[PDB]
Amino acid sequence: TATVLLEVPFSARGDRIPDAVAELRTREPIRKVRTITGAEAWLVSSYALCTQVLEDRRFSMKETAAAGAPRLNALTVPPEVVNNMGNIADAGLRKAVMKAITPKAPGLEQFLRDTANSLLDNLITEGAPADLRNDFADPLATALHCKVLGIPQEDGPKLFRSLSIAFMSSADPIPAAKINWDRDIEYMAGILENPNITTGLMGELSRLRKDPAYSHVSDELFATIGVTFFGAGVISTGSFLTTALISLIQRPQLRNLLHEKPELIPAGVEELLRINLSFADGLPRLATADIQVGDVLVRKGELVLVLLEGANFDPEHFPNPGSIELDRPNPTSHLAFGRGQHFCPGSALGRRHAQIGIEALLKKMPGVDLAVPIDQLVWRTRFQRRIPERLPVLW
Numbered sequence: 087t088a089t090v091l092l093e094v095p096f097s098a099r100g101d102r103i104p105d106a107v108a109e110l111r112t113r114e115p116i117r118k119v120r121t122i123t124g125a126e127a128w129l130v131s132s133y134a135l136c137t138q139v140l141e142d143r144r145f146s147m148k149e150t151a152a153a154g155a156p157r158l159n160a161l162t163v164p165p166e167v168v169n170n171m172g173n174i175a176d177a178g179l180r181k182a183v184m185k186a187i188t189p190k191a192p193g194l195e196q197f198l199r200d201t202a203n204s205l206l207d208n209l210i211t212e213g214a215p216a217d218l219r220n221d222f223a224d225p226l227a228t229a230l231h232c233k234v235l236g237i238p239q240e241d242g243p244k245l246f247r248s249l250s251i252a253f254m255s256s257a258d259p260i261p262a263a264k265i266n267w268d269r270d271i272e273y274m275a276g277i278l279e280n281p282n283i284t285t286g287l288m289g290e291l292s293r294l295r296k297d298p299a300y301s302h303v304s305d306e307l308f309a310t311i312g313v314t315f316f317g318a319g320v321i322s323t324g325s326f327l328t329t330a331l332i333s334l335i336q337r338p339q340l341r342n343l344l345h346e347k348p349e350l351i352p353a354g355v356e357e358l359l360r361i362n363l364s365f366a367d368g369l370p371r372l373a374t375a376d377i378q379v380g381d382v383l384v385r386k387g388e389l390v391l392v393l394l395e396g397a398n399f400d401p402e403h404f405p406n407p408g409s410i411e412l413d414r415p416n417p418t419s420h421l422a423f424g425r426g427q428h429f430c431p432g433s434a435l436g437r438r439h440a441q442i443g444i445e446a447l448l449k450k451m452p453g454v455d456l457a458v459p460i461d462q463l464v465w466r467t468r469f470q471r472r473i474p475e476r477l478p479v480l481w
């Protein structure tokens with residue numbers, strides 16, 4: 087009979103990869119698909135072709151925002167913000183931004199440990215079941231990013247509550263996204279004017295804003311950096327830690343190994359990154375030339391989607407890809423943080439947030455287990471991350 091063009095995304099479930107990804111990678115590692123907008127796109131699912139796309143800048147991030155392009159989903163930010171990191175570099179701020187978002191600031195890791203332990207103590211006081219997303223992973227991400235930005239902890243929750251809309255993956259524009267964006271930009275602009283904000287990313291930007299070497303950088307860009315790095319960081323670390331906790335909980339042996347030998351936690355977190363399904367969609371790129379990718383000549387103006395778990399579960403690159411193995415010879419060679427020009431600038435911070443969160447959880451809750459059958463988790467739909475709405479656990 088007549089069937090329709092394969093639709094993406096395949097599944098919003100973040101606890102398991104569909105058997106179909108490996109079939110696709112074997113048969114057609116670059117394949118035409120239809121996005122939620124009705125646009126056509128090329129879905130790339132092997133490690134070799136994913137790397138190729140990500141390392142060829144003729145597959146452009148910023149051109150995805152062009153009027154009239156085939157879209158994966160609607161913009162939730164102004165179109166110039168799709169080029170955020172390019173704009174930051176053009177302003178001469180890349181080195182300073184990247185320095186402020188490392189985990190190296192004195193006291194930062196101790197703050198993370200302290201926060202995690204306090205969050206966990208409060209759950210233990212309250213009694214099982216506990217929700218490890220809403221009452222551990224996300225608050226820990228939110229607290230971390232207020233500290234990194236230099237802004238009050240008490241301002242965290244409001245900025246955070248924009249994110250269930252900001253990171254939607256929608257066929258159509260979202261009126262609430264503009265409402266929240268304008269509000270959060272105004273908040274950050276106020277932060278730059280606030281004399282009490284002297285530390286973290288916003289303290290440093292606020293100084294640079296008054297330094298004559300940056301007098302022609304726009305105020306809008308300074309506020310944009312705060313909103314976008316808070317939102318990207320919080321959504322990415324909170325969502326990654328949440329689904330890494332599921333993967334750990336599902337593996338009691340690994341849980342007990344990391345609990346007994348916490349010096350292995352970094353290698354375990356690197357494998358959890360490798361197998362992580364937090365990104366709900368392929369990474370989008372627009373071709374700016376005709377480019378051969380595998381068996382397909384991608385044409386100028388076409389949309390390409392780089393499926394991270396396609397690369398990261400590719401057995402040609404990671405043998406026994408579904409197994410967490412702490413002694414792989416190529417352990418950071420995954421694509422969890424992307425690759426190339428747009429490699430995640432928060433990568434070290436994201437690693438440390440997950441390592442510290444996991445270390446603290448295994449110490450406080452060595453008997454942690456799901457308090458519901460895994461199929462009872464509710465997976466968020468039409469979102470840029472795969473997130474269970476609640477993560478009920480007992481210990």
Ligand code: HEM
Pocket residue numbers: 147171172187314315316318319320322323326364369370421422423424425427428429430431432433435436437
């Ligand atoms: C485990 C945590 C994280 C994961 C898995 C993650 C993942 C990624 C990925 C895959 C990309 C590449 C997107 C692409 O090429 O289209 C990216 C880029 C980006 N990430 Fe992260 N991220 C994480 C944490 C962070 C943090 C903590 C921040 C900031 C505080 C951050 C800020 C950004 C920004 C601003 C970009 C865009 C870079 C560019 O366009 O050059 N991420 N992230």
Ligand SMILES: c1ccc2c(CCc3ccnc(N4CCOCC4)n3)c[nH]c2c1
Pocket residue numbers: 162163167168170171248249251252253263264266267268270313314315316317318
């Ligand atoms: C309302 C509307 C949008 C937001 C955001 C940002 C959402 C978003 C979407 C897509 N890309 C990106 N980034 C591109 C790369 O640089 C990092 C940021 N950021 C935070 N809070 C909001 C409130």
Ligand SMILES: [Cl-]
Pocket residue numbers: 103104105106
């Ligand atoms: Cl399946």
Ligand SMILES: [Cl-]
Pocket residue numbers: 151152153
């Ligand atoms: Cl345009």
Ligand SMILES: [Cl-]
Pocket residue numbers: 250251
């Ligand atoms: Cl919602």
Ligand SMILES: [Cl-]
Pocket residue numbers: none
């Ligand atoms: Cl200049």
Ligand SMILES: [Cl-]
Pocket residue numbers: 376377378
């Ligand atoms: Cl070529």
Ligand SMILES: [Cl-]
Pocket residue numbers: 133134400402403
């Ligand atoms: Cl390979």
